[PDB]
Amino acid sequence: MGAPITAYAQQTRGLLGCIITSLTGRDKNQVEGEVQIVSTATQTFLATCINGVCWTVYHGAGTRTIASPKGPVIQMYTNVDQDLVGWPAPQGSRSLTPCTCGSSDLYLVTRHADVIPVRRRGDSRGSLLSPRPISYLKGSSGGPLLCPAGHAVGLFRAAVCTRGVAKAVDFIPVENLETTMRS
Amino acid sequence: VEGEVQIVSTATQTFLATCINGVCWTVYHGAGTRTIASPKGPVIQMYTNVDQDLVGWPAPQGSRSLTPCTCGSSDLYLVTRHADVIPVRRRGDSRGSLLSPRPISYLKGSSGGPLLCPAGHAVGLFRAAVCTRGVAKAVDFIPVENLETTM
């Protein structure tokens, strides 16, 4: 990967095609990118492909199957406690690689394809250098937090809000991903 | 698609502009007080700062704005008029050194271009290259704050 981290988004389907696809569980669409904007019939969020696996937040995907060209695909991993789930990365996607530098300077990629700076304050916390309204981060759960090199340091899970403005973010560090696989 | 960086020309020369906070900024040494073309006629500069070598008109059509950097990183990246990205280490407020010096020919026509941080956020606007013997070893730039202040 490289820097500066720049990202863009593309919508691939709408509400009706999404509902149909959700039921049939068969999606014939072409897949590209490291992060997929994903949706159930109740909510929409993100899923990040790290090392051949498409990871996302359990509180979003539950135990559901991901719709694929060959019909539904069951999850490879499920960890209610760590709030993780993973499916084999879709055919066409590009995976990110875990961070191996321990940089405290993280960058969150939102569902709007905006990358916002986050200062790591702990294993699963980092503070937004420029806080934003929580409505801005809605739908970004499952999205990546990269180090200056563009490597996955963790997955966005929850926001730390005060009066509707998020000051910090709660994430799932890649270590939990490794652990969830060994489990 | 919408672009953040516009490639402009004045007959005299050609350089770049960068939309930050809805304003299309570029170098005074390129545009001067010139207006920018529009399908409805010439549009005038919203800001002109001869002192800072900074001029800005309202962001044009087919453009999208860059966000100022708020992470402080010293690891900058310059985007040229050819879309080439060049890693630059921040030496100070308006100076940064190329990690791999290039002949000035490579940095030509890029004034006005953005000086991005690791997050693709604007740090400054490429003002002019600082070179030794035809080799651009570093660059001069206008920090975003100057722009945020000019507004």
Partner: peptide, 16 residues
């Protein structure tokens, strides 16, 4: 004269 826009650059590389 007037400054004309001869082209555009998209930092993310968004195609189309």
């Amino acid at each position: 004269g007037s400054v004309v826009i001869v082209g555009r650059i998209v930092l993310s590389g968004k195609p189309a």
